[PDB]
Write an enzyme that holds these catalytic residues in place. Structure first.
Site, PDB file in Angstrom:
ATOM      1  N   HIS A 246       6.856 -11.925 -41.448  1.00 50.29           N
ATOM      2  CA  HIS A 246       8.032 -11.229 -41.992  1.00 50.29           C
ATOM      3  C   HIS A 246       9.044 -12.315 -42.375  1.00 50.29           C
ATOM      4  O   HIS A 246       9.608 -12.310 -43.474  1.00 50.29           O
ATOM      5  CB  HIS A 246       8.661 -10.303 -40.941  1.00 50.29           C
ATOM      6  CG  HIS A 246       9.954  -9.675 -41.383  1.00 50.29           C
ATOM      7  ND1 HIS A 246      10.018  -8.417 -41.942  1.00 50.29           N
ATOM      8  CD2 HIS A 246      11.223 -10.148 -41.380  1.00 50.29           C
ATOM      9  CE1 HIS A 246      11.271  -8.141 -42.265  1.00 50.29           C
ATOM     10  NE2 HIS A 246      12.024  -9.177 -41.935  1.00 50.29           N
ATOM     11  N   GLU A 247       9.278 -13.249 -41.459  1.00 52.27           N
ATOM     12  CA  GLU A 247      10.213 -14.341 -41.728  1.00 52.27           C
ATOM     13  C   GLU A 247       9.700 -15.231 -42.870  1.00 52.27           C
ATOM     14  O   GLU A 247      10.477 -15.675 -43.722  1.00 52.27           O
ATOM     15  CB  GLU A 247      10.433 -15.186 -40.462  1.00 52.27           C
ATOM     16  CG  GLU A 247      11.144 -14.445 -39.325  1.00 52.27           C
ATOM     17  CD  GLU A 247      12.438 -13.788 -39.772  1.00 52.27           C
ATOM     18  OE1 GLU A 247      13.206 -14.425 -40.529  1.00 52.27           O
ATOM     19  OE2 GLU A 247      12.694 -12.634 -39.364  1.00 52.27           O
TER      20      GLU A 247
ATOM     21  N   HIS B 139      10.726 -14.050 -46.197  1.00 53.24           N
ATOM     22  CA  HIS B 139      12.096 -14.427 -46.538  1.00 53.24           C
ATOM     23  C   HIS B 139      12.073 -15.874 -47.035  1.00 53.24           C
ATOM     24  O   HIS B 139      12.774 -16.227 -47.981  1.00 53.24           O
ATOM     25  CB  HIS B 139      13.018 -14.343 -45.317  1.00 53.24           C
ATOM     26  CG  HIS B 139      13.350 -12.945 -44.890  1.00 53.24           C
ATOM     27  ND1 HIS B 139      13.851 -11.997 -45.759  1.00 53.24           N
ATOM     28  CD2 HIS B 139      13.297 -12.350 -43.676  1.00 53.24           C
ATOM     29  CE1 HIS B 139      14.096 -10.880 -45.097  1.00 53.24           C
ATOM     30  NE2 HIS B 139      13.769 -11.068 -43.831  1.00 53.24           N
TER      31      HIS B 139
ATOM     32  N   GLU C  99      16.076  -7.579 -48.144  1.00 53.06           N
ATOM     33  CA  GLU C  99      15.581  -7.301 -46.799  1.00 53.06           C
ATOM     34  C   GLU C  99      14.702  -6.055 -46.798  1.00 53.06           C
ATOM     35  O   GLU C  99      13.654  -6.018 -46.145  1.00 53.06           O
ATOM     36  CB  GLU C  99      16.741  -7.118 -45.812  1.00 53.06           C
ATOM     37  CG  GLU C  99      16.292  -6.769 -44.384  1.00 53.06           C
ATOM     38  CD  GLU C  99      15.512  -7.899 -43.699  1.00 53.06           C
ATOM     39  OE1 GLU C  99      16.126  -8.946 -43.377  1.00 53.06           O
ATOM     40  OE2 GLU C  99      14.290  -7.733 -43.486  1.00 53.06           O
TER      41      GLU C  99
ATOM     42  N   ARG D  86       6.715  -1.010 -36.872  1.00 56.37           N
ATOM     43  CA  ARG D  86       7.659   0.102 -36.933  1.00 56.37           C
ATOM     44  C   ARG D  86       7.505   0.843 -38.257  1.00 56.37           C
ATOM     45  O   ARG D  86       7.027   0.278 -39.242  1.00 56.37           O
ATOM     46  CB  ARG D  86       9.090  -0.424 -36.776  1.00 56.37           C
ATOM     47  CG  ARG D  86       9.499  -1.388 -37.879  1.00 56.37           C
ATOM     48  CD  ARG D  86      10.670  -2.286 -37.490  1.00 56.37           C
ATOM     49  NE  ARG D  86      11.877  -1.540 -37.149  1.00 56.37           N
ATOM     50  CZ  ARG D  86      13.093  -2.080 -37.094  1.00 56.37           C
ATOM     51  NH1 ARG D  86      13.258  -3.370 -37.367  1.00 56.37           N
ATOM     52  NH2 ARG D  86      14.140  -1.335 -36.764  1.00 56.37           N
TER      53      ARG D  86
END
Ligand SMILES: [Ca+2]
Ligand SMILES: [Ca+2]
Ligand SMILES: [Zn+2]
EC number: 3.4.24.69
Length: 1287
Positions: free
Chosen positions: A229-230, A233, A267, A369
């Protein structure tokens, strides 16, 4: 391929792969950090990230850094060399796991090859400048104790350990002079604070966590996905596309609103799934345009770059070649670079919608999630990621060799306990809202439990701007999607262009902006006396130091006393729960109360079909008092009246822009450019409709569906508090007994909890279905229509705009100014249907939508119902209903239209519902009761047609009219063409099933036919193929209009309209649902009543009636007299004949005024013999199969049964009822049913057969037969005098 290097923390510095780095935020001062090159351009520094943080802030305090995170603190993490080495080996393992699949290997390859451009906005177009903090980072070569020798290197990513909060992973970009290279196309060195062991925990609302409320629930995250996920980014920052645009900002004007940082589209894109849908198409295009503009600046730079001043050793060609490939620019045979729209689009979509957390999780079979907007739970600690028995490179936690691959069992907290440990609560900090009453008791509420409601400022208003249409102008759509499979198979995605050497000149310009962070109070005190969701949930808890509680239905008492716990379940449940018994009866009581709990919870499956609501959870209001005080009054009724809206804590102010005007540019003498313009303007028009719908969806998801999510979570908590409370009571009662008593008490606490938990799970499923239905309902009825209004307005404005354009160019268009004239009318004619799947591919959301659209009841666009002495539309579309003074209304939902001019109803329909589907598709259903003709007025009755319901607009529409015994449905298209279909009932029948009796009408219309159904059965059909467009949303006027008699009237009930064609099955179901009642009915169809005079009718002997025999205490059966006059049009048998009966109540001496007769009631069947009231009796001792009933004065004889039980043996709709004589209410000894029997009489003078009023046991078995025999002689109906029937 990607090579992951190996090393140990204590390995020697070699100034190559193991160095002493000078981090960008160190400003070239302070100390250096031992860094390890895990892969080309990527470094790991196994130390805490301290830049911008106060040393003491690494300790848990009364403050917090982020308002939406359960923050874990631990200043000792990474404080030893062995801990640092473990961090290193763990990172190596995570990187290996990432590259274990092509998708992750490609993410890494893209990141490694996505080298920052050599420079930023300040650098001249002609140069490459490596001497900036976003390009070059230094390494110390000199020996320890001296910074004498420094060397520069190019880098892409530097990963540090965590900052103060271990579970708050973050990717950071470098800003210089208030600007970010990573947000302007260049890209720049990226940094990250990451922690592999302390991972987030999440639980899916729509899914049970192994379904165990007494066990640990939820799933823990796979640190590899957290890292990816990071890395996404990082990817965005490296390609310089981490741009800022209109962010989602939470509304914080009300105390129940969740406070949080603004959320950028980047995001939401990074997370994927449904989140990109919260970013409107307008903003999606805004961001797209900004990134494209940034790339244009880069491509221009590549065409102009001539030298690199900072490093004479930089090979200009090598970098131009590398940057050309990085941004996917194209180069001609001359070396000129340009942007290729196709390649740019693919790259952009790959980076924003391809590499997403959701897509990666799906590909790696890792559970995550459901959305960015999902409550956060306490993080947990993974015991040992380096232990292949618990976590592997190939499968993470979900190891098949341990049967943990299925259903992500390896990440399930209730299943894989061996993998993790719970965190010490003393080291956790969370932002709480302290809600204090004005006195003053206070309740703490985690900010994460509040409602997240995006503020109106969150959405773009670009739709309000003008648009210039030209032969050029084309559509603009950005699919927030990218086929992950093609990305994984894309042959030219990954660069095969040489990566330049990382060594360069030392950085000397350390100018950089270093963020400064600081904690803020972990508790915010507010004042409110509101008793909403938070207070209601709180009242269902009890302190840890208390073990003896009692349940109460009093919310106020529950708040006042610590030993009182609020319960939203029934009065009986509450009483039984507080009951104390003897040990010998304890096991019985446990079974009883636990069973009651399940019953109460299961009421969440309650149906409300008569009110056109398939599902409703009656106790939600009592459980949470959420929204508009839903705990007061009857929730079901309130819901029937206002719908989903009553559950919302806040009604959002929606942004629905007036669509900007179009500017059609002309091209004199140009037939093509003009035609093209017109067409383009038409297509652009559709883009406008789509973008508007997208704007609606974004708002619905971030302001409405979020509130419903909170309600779902609220109910889960509420149900658990109830089970926990019952568990506490059971425990207390059991422990009051001695050990000797306990030993003899048969109780299984695990079986108790199992049953309670199962009950909760069943309830949660119903609740989730109910709430999702409510959410979609609000979207479709309270949001979409408001958008359609603006879009239709826009269409009209654009309509004349285009026509006026076709006029001004009439010449240059010659013989076509008409062809394209209609081309505009027919295009702006058919509007765009809203399809949620167009704005999202999220399965959950799509399924919610499809389910909603599969419910025929959601097709109701008008439902006129009685509520507070008035008729209102409960369809949810808010039609305005004006009921004038001459209309009679009663609480049985019946309304009367009379001959008076003021006896009318005016309904103004919602003009924004897709009704004109462009082929006609709708149904109308209602009950009606039409009075019998006046015998002396039969000619006018059959001759004068009169309208009763008219719906017209522009001389087009529909109407329901009546001509005597015929009801007519008529359609009129825009051209004036008319078609009709009718139902005519016979007026020469001895006994009619329709005259003056309530019956159900349903009319359906489709592209081919117009059909009329009566009581669920098809009666008439008319081919309506030729009929063209029919306007059906005009005003609806309910009023008798024609040449009618002053005495003419009509009764109507349950008038409703569906914007679809009902099937025979739908109609039949509606007929049965609306026919249902607890009470019996009379001949006319009205409720049967006590103390009301009735003549009796026998369904099996239609033309027969009962008369007290002159010389005997029996009822002889005679033949009904009939219509006597000479009209050829009519015939009937008299109905007001025979004894006048009256039904009396058996019990309760509440006098004899009147009341409703219900099935199974015990009654006395009486009748009037002159000035006396007599009764119907059965001689107790008859031995034959049947016998004549005994009619005599009221008295109590031991020899006669006098009590009757009124029954309804027919399961299908009927106005017939049966009368049963039982030995007594108690027993199951049936004497027989009242009927008619034929006897033979042979006297000295007469010989013949005669029928008598009897009781017979023969009927008992016959009424059980299916289908129910309507012709049985035990079927009776009661006929009272009625103005609608004269004879
Ligand atoms: Ca979007
Ligand atoms: Ca209490
Ligand atoms: Zn993120």
């Amino acid at each position: 391929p990607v090579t992951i290097n190996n090393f140990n923390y204590n390995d020697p510095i070699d100034n190559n792969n193991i160095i002493m780095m000078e981090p960008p935020f160190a400003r070239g001062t302070g100390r250096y950090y031992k860094a390890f090159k895990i892969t080309d351009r990527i470094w790991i520094i196994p130390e805490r990230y301290t830049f911008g943080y106060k040393p003491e802030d690494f300790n848990k305090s009364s403050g917090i850094f982020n308002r939406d995170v359960c923050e874990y603190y631990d200043p000792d993490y990474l404080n030893t060399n062995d801990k640092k080495n473990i961090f290193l080996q763990t990172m190596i393992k995570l990187f290996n796991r990432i590259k274990s699949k092509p998708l992750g290997e490609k993410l890494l390859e893209m990141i490694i090859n996505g080298i920052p451009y050599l420079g930023d906005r300040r650098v001249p177009l002609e140069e490459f400048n490596t001497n900036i903090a976003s390009v070059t980072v230094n390494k110390l070569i000199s020996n320890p104790g001296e910074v004498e020798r420094k060397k520069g290197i190019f880098a892409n990513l530097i990963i540090f350990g965590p900052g103060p909060v271990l579970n708050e992973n973050e990717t950071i970009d470098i800003g210089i002079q208030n600007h970010f290279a990573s947000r302007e196309g260049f890209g720049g060195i990226m940094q990250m604070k990451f922690c592999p062991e302390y991972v987030s925990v999440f639980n899916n609302v729509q899914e049970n966590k192994g379904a165990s409320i007494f066990n640990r629930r939820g799933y823990f995250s796979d640190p590899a996905l957290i890292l990816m996920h990071e890395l996404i980014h990082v990817l965005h920052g490296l390609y310089g596309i981490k741009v800022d645009d209109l962010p989602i900002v939470p509304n914080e004007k009300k105390f129940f609103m969740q406070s949080t940082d603004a959320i950028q589209a980047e995001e939401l894109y990074t997370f994927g799934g449904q989140d990109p849908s919260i970013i409107t198409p307008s903003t999606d295009k805004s961001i797209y345009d900004k990134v494209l503009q940034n790339f244009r600046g880069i491509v221009d730079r590549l065409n102009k770059v001539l030298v690199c001043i900072s490093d004479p050793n930089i090979n200009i060609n090598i970098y131009k070649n590398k940057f050309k490939d990085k941004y996917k620019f194209v180069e001609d045979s001359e070396g000129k670079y340009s942007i290729d729209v196709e390649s740019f689009d693919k790259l952009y979509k790959s980076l924003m919608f391809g590499f997403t957390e959701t897509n990666i999780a799906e590909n790696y079979k890792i559970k995550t999630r459901a959305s960015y907007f999902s409550d956060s739970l306490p993080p947990v600690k993974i015991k040992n990621l380096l232990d292949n028995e618990i976590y592997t490179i190939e499968e993470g936690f979900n190891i098949s060799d341990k049967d943990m691959e299925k259903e992500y069992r390896g990440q399930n907290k209730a299943i894989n306990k061996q993998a993790y440990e719970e965190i010490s609560k003393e080291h956790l900090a969370v932002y709480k809202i302290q809600m204090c009453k004005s006195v003053g008791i206070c309740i703490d509420v985690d900010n994460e439990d509040l409602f997240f409601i995006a503020d109106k400022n969150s959405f773009s208003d670009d739709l309000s701007k003008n648009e210039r249409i030209e032969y050029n102008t084309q559509s603009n759509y950005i699919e927030n999607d990218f086929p992950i499979n093609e990305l994984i198979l894309d042959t030219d995605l990954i660069s095969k262009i040489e990566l330049p050497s990382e060594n360069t000149e030392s950085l000397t310009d350390f100018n950089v902006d270093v963020p400064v962070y600081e904690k803020q109070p972990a508790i915010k005190k507010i004042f409110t006396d509101e008793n909403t969701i938070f207070q209601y949930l709180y009242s269902q808890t009890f302190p840890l130091d208390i073990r003896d509680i009692s349940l109460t239905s009093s919310f106020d008492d529950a708040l006042l006393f610590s030993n009182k716990v609020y319960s939203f379940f029934s009065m009986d449940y509450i009483k039984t729960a507080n009951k104390v018994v003897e040990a010998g009866l304890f096991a019985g009581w446990v079974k009883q109360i636990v069973n009651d709990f399940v019953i109460e919870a299961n009421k969440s499956n309650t149906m409300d079909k008569i009110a056109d609501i398939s599902l409703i959870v009656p106790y939600i209001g009592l459980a949470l008092n959420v929204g508009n005080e839903t705990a007061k009054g009857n929730f079901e009724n309130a819901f029937e009246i206002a719908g989903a809206s009553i559950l919302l804590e806040f009604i959002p102010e929606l942004l629905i822009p007036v669509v900007g005007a179009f500017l059609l540019e002309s091209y004199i003498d140009n037939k093509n450019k003009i035609i093209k313009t017109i067409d383009n303007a038409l297509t652009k028009r559709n883009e406008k409709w789509s973008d508007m719908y997208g704007l609606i969806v974004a708002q619905w998801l971030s302001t409405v569906n979020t509130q419903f999510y909170t309600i779902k979570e609220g109910m889960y908590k509420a149900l658990n508090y109830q089970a926990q409370a019952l568990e506490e009571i059971i425990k207390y009662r059991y422990n009051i007994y001695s050990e000797k008593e306990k030993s003899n008490i048969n109780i299984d606490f695990n079986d108790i909890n199992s049953k309670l938990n199962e009950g909760i799970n069943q309830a949660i499923d119903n609740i989730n279905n109910f709430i999702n239905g409510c959410s979609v309902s609000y979207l479709m009825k309270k949001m979409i229509p408001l958008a359609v209004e603006k879009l239709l307005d826009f269409d009209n404005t654009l309509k004349k705009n285009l026509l006026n354009y076709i006029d001004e160019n009439k010449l240059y268009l010659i013989g076509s100014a008409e062809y394209e004239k209609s081309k505009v009318n027919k295009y702006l004619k058919t509007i765009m249907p809203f399809d949620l799947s167009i704005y999202t591919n999220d399965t959950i959301l799509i399924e919610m939508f499809n389910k909603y659209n599969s419910e025929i009841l959601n097709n109701i666009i008008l439902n006129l119902r009685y509520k507070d002495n008035n008729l209102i539309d409960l369809s949810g579309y808010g039609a305005k209903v004006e009921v004038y003074d001459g209309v009679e209304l009663n609480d049985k939902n019946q309304f009367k239209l009379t001959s008076s001019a003021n006896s009318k109803i005016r309904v103004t329909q919602n003009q924004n519902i897709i009704f004109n589907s462009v082929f006609l598709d709708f149904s109308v259903s209602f009950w009606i009761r039409i009075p019998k003709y006046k015998n002396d007025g039969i000619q006018n009755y059959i001759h004068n047609e009169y309208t009763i319901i008219n719906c017209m607009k522009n001389n087009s529409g529909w109407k329901i009219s009546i001509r005597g015994n015929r009801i007519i449905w008529t359609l009129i298209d825009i051209n004036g063409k008319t078609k009709s279909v009718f139902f005519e009932y016979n007026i020469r029948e001895d006994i009619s099933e329709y005259i003056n009796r309530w019956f159900f009408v349903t009319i359906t219309n489709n592209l081919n036919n117009a059909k009329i159904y009566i009581n669920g059965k098809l009666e008439s059909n008319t081919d309506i193929k030729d009929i063209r467009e029919v306007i059906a949303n005009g005003e609806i006027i309910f009023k008798l209009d024609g040449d009618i008699d002053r005495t003419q009237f009509i009764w109507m009930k349950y008038f409703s309209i569906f914007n679809t064609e009902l099937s025979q099955s739908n109609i039949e179901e509606r007929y049965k649902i609306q026919s249902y009642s607890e009470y019996l009915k009379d001949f006319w169809g009205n409720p049967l009543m006590y103390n009301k005079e009735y003549y009796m009718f026998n369904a099996g002997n239609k033309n027969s009636y009962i008369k007290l025999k002159k010389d005997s205490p029996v009822g002889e059966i005679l033949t009904r007299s009939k219509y006597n006059q000479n009209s050829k049009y009519i015939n009937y048998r008299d109905l007001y004949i025979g004894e006048k009966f009256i039904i009396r109540r058996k019990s309760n001496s509440q006098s004899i005024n009147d009341d409703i007769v219900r099935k199974e009631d015990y009654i006395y069947l009486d009748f009037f013999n002159l000035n006396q009231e007599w009764r119907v009796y059965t001689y107790k001792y008859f031995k034959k199969e049947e016998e004549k009933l005994f009619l005599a004065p009221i008295s109590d004889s031991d020899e006669f049964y006098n009590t009757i039980q009124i029954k309804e043996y027919d399961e299908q709709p009927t106005y017939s009822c049966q009368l049963l004589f039982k030995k007594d209410e108690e027993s199951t000894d049936e004497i027989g049913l009242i009927g008619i029997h034929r006897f033979y009489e042979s006297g000295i003078v007469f010989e013949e057969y005669k029928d008598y009023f009897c009781i017979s046991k023969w009927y008992l078995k016959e009424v059980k037969r299916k289908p129910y025999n309507l012709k049985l002689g035990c079927n009776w109906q009661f006929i009272p005098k009625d103005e609608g029937w004269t004879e």
